[PDB]
């Protein structure tokens, strides 16, 4: 005697626990999850962030003050 796969497709609909949105259709929420990246990497969108934060042009010993 042991269980297996006897029943129905009972998943469970719930509101997006990442941004705070609410969904009713599993298929609809499945797409929204992509926006965040739930175990996936959704790319193709346009992005143009600022340049990295770094600099150069300094000595090796530094200033001798103290
Ligand atoms: Zn969300």
From Swiss-Prot:
Compartments where found: Nucleus
Domain of life: Eukaryota
Tissue: Ubiquitous.
Leader sequence residues: none
Zinc finger (C2H2-type): 14-36
Family indicated by similarity: Belongs to the krueppel C2H2-type zinc-finger protein family.
Disease: A chromosomal aberration involving PATZ1 is associated with small round cell sarcoma. Translocation t(1;22)(p36.1;q12) with EWSR1.
Complex formation: Homodimer. Interacts with RNF4. Interacts (via C-terminus) with TP53; this interaction inhibits TP53 ability to activate transcription.
Job of this protein: Transcriptional regulator that plays a role in many biological processes such as embryogenesis, senescence, T-cell development or neurogenesis. Interacts with the TP53 protein to control genes that are important in proliferation and in the DNA-damage response. Mechanistically, the interaction inhibits the DNA binding and transcriptional activity of TP53/p53. Part of the transcriptional network modulating regulatory T-cell development and controls the generation of the regulatory T-cell pool under homeostatic conditions. (Microbial infection) Plays a positive role in viral cDNA synthesis.
Protein name in the entry: POZ-, AT hook-, and zinc finger-containing protein 1
Gene name in the database record: PATZ1
Segment of the intact protein contained: 286 to 338 of 687
């Amino acid at each position: 005697g042991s269980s297996g796969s006897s029943g129905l497709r009972e998943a469970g609909i719930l509101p997006c626990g990442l941004c705070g949105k609410v969904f009713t259709d599993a298929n609809r929420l499945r797409q929204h999850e992509a926006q965040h990246g739930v175990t996936s990497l959704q790319l193709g969108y346009i992005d143009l962030p600022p340049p990295r934060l770094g600099e150069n042009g300094l000595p090796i010993s530094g200033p001798s003050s103290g």
